[PDB]
């Protein structure tokens, strides 16, 4: 009875969605001028990681960036001068994520040890210290984004996102709903909501305060590897193993556009938006990042400079540059 | 001021000095992924390396080995297995005595072999629990032909090395299982990576040299590939 009733609400929800699709972003933006040909060039190549870079993050200052590598090292670089400010040796060599605090005082990371370790950079002593270890996840830690100096949100391979309190190290809110490994997180600009992409071809919008799944987005055919909010926080983009990127609207609750080409048959590892949101930077497994016109689905450009799989992307807060990590152990900066 | 510029450049030189010391240790150490199942007996192989994720360190001939057992994860491994694309070898441990779950081990080996990120990582296959397999065959209460009908028209290969006082049925059974894995290994693996089958039990005073010898062979063949010789 519930099996038929489950599809009753899905059909009713889908029916309500069709009542709001009077046009498409493809045909609305049919008349806008294209962005041209985005020709970014490697302005900086950061060397020093022995093994592949799994993730990196930008500081709010748009100059200091942190990168993680599968050799137990958390290097904090100076992008302007190519200088290693810190190089934090981790207990676990298998680290899949890293986050730089908005205040810059802390850095977090974790991976296959199921722990989001918090590192203190502004210690009164010479070197850094491990501030706190977060234990409580029952699978590999895939993402972790700081909210404040004391709140961090972590997405794990145990199909669970958790909101922590670094003061006590306990899990305050637990976000459950995904039936697959949660691989990516993105925080809204206001940090009141965060969107989450899992290995079940679905993305969920979570309320941080309420702790409940506000909306669920489907459209993708395979595992969503990457997710990123739009700058204005009313949309997000996802990248999956089906060699496609999709842009979803929060308010309309429908997929607005798809970023696919016939030549593209490799998964998207990372997505990012330029400061304006007009360019969607997507890293592929074909070793090069494509620049997508986010209002026309046209391939504006290509960042072909990496020898292995492109792991992570990031656009700076001020939008100066794009950092692009890869499995070749080199973090390059494009402008 | 310009005082910070030289201090910043000095701290980078100190950082880089430590990174050179770490790079020597990192390149000198071989990382192995230990795979297997509940009944495989990976633990017993770990117990033999007395010389979220469980790390083992053993030393053979003054070479450091790091074996990783990823025990703290769910049954879905398609995302975290991409972490171990840079390891020297995958230690694949199979319970050769359990024919019911043998096809799962064949399918797991085939997915590993054919993965886009593990298609250059040689597999050291350990066909564990040879003691249990030997006693299982002579009992006769369980037949391999029930689970693998191709066992009916299979004969022991010429290049077989039975142990002294070994029943021929055990040698045919134990080589058929080895050949099932080598059918997958040879179908897609062309010079990029190789399988290294072994037979082992819980009582083996060995498998630390076996991994060391097979890792030496993996490193040798990597060099000969660069020279375009192999």
């Amino acid at each position, epitope marked *: 009875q519930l099996r038929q009733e489950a599809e009753q609400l899905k059909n009713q929800i889908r029916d309500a969605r069709k009542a709001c699709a009077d046009a498409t972003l493809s045909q609305i933006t049919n008349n806008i001028d294209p962005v041209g040909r985005i020709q970014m060039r490697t302005r900086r190549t950061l060397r020093g990681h022995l093994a592949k870079i799994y993730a990196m993050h930008w500081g709010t200052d748009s100059r200091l960036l942190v990168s993680a590598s599968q050799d137990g090292k958390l290097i904090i670089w100076d992008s302007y001068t190519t200088n290693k400010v810190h190089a934090i040796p981790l207990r676990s060599s298998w680290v899949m994520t890293c986050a730089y605090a908005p205040s810059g005082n802390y850095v977090a990371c974790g991976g296959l040890d199921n722990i989001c370790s918090i590192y203190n950079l502004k210690t009164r002593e010479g070197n850094v210290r491990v501030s706190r270890e977060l234990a409580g996840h029952t699978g590999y830690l895939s993402c972790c984004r700081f909210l404040d100096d004391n709140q961090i949100v972590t997405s794990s391979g145990d199909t669970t996102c958790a909101l922590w309190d670094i003061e006590t190290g306990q899990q305050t809110t637990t976000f459950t709903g995904h*039936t697959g490994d949660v691989m990516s997180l993105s925080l809204a600009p206001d940090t009141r909501l965060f969107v989450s992409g899992a290995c079940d*071809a679905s993305a969920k919008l979570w309320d941080v305060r309420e702790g409940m799944c506000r909306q669920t987005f489907t459209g993708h*055919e*395979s595992d969503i590897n990457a997710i990123c909010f739009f700058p204005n926080g009313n949309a997000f983009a996802t990248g999956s193993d089906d060699a496609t990127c999709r842009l979803f609207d929060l308010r309309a609750d429908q997929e607005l556009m798809t970023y696919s080409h016939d030549n593209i048959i490799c998964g998207i590892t990372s997505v990012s938006f330029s400061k304006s949101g007009r360019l969607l930077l997507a890293g592929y497994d074909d070793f090069n990042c494509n620049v997508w016109d986010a209002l026309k689905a046209d391939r504006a450009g290509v960042l072909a400079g990496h020898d292995n799989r492109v792991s992570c992307l990031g656009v700076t807060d001020d939008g100066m540059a794009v950092a692009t990590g890869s499995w070749d152990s080199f973090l390059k900066i494009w402008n | 001021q310009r005082n910070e510029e030289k201090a910043q450049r000095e701290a980078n030189k100190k950082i880089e000095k430590q990174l050179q010391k770490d790079k020597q240790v990192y390149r000198a150490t071989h990382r192995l992924l230990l795979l297997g199942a509940d009944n495989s007996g990976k633990s017993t192989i770990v117990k033999q390396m007395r010389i979220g994720i469980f790390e083992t360190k053993f030393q053979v001939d003054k070479v450091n080995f790091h074996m990783f057992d990823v025990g703290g994860q769910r049954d879905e491994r398609r995302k975290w297995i991409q972490c171990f694309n840079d390891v020297t070898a995958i230690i694949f441990v199979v319970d050769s005595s359990d024919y019911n779950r043998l*096809q*799962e081990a064949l399918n797991l080996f085939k*997915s590993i072999w054919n993965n886009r990120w593990l298609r250059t990582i040689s597999v050291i296959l350990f066909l564990n629990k040879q003691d249990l397999l030997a006693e299982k065959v002579l009992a006769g209460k369980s037949k391999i032909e029930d*689970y*693998f009908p191709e066992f009916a028209r299979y004969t022991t290969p010429e290049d077989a090395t039975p142990e002294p006082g070994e029943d021929p049925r055990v040698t045919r059974a134990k080589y058929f299982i080895r050949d099932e894995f080598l059918r997958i290994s040879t179908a897609s693996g062309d010079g990029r990576h190789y399988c290294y089958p072994h037979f082992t039990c819980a009582v083996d005073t060995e498998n630390a040299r076996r991994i060391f010898n097979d890792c030496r062979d993996i490193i040798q063949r990597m060099h000969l590939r660069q020279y375009e010789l192999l």
Partner: nanobody
Amino acid sequence: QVQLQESGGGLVQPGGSLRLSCAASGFTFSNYKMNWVRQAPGKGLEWVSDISQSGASISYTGSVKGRFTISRDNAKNTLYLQMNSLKPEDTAVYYCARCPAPFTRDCFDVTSTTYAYRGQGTQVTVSS
């Protein structure tokens, strides 16, 4: 939305012929390697058979070799498992599984406890 609905299966005598159709939707059928997985009552999930994108390559578990025939129809987006000589040991719930990635020779996690790209399944109860 990725959906895999299976039809057929139910009560049948030993040695009977039974056909399962898996209607796949919400993805490009022709790109993915398909699979068949069964779960015997009070037992773990077991892999039965797989078919490639085109149908050139086929595999079987060994217990169903020479009795089960797997065919795909790219045109109708359907997956088939033709049963010929059933046994009382074949009673299980048959799920039609799909490879996670769209152009790959490897099926990872198809027989997992909570795999996402599997159908609800059809009970195939075979008895006298």
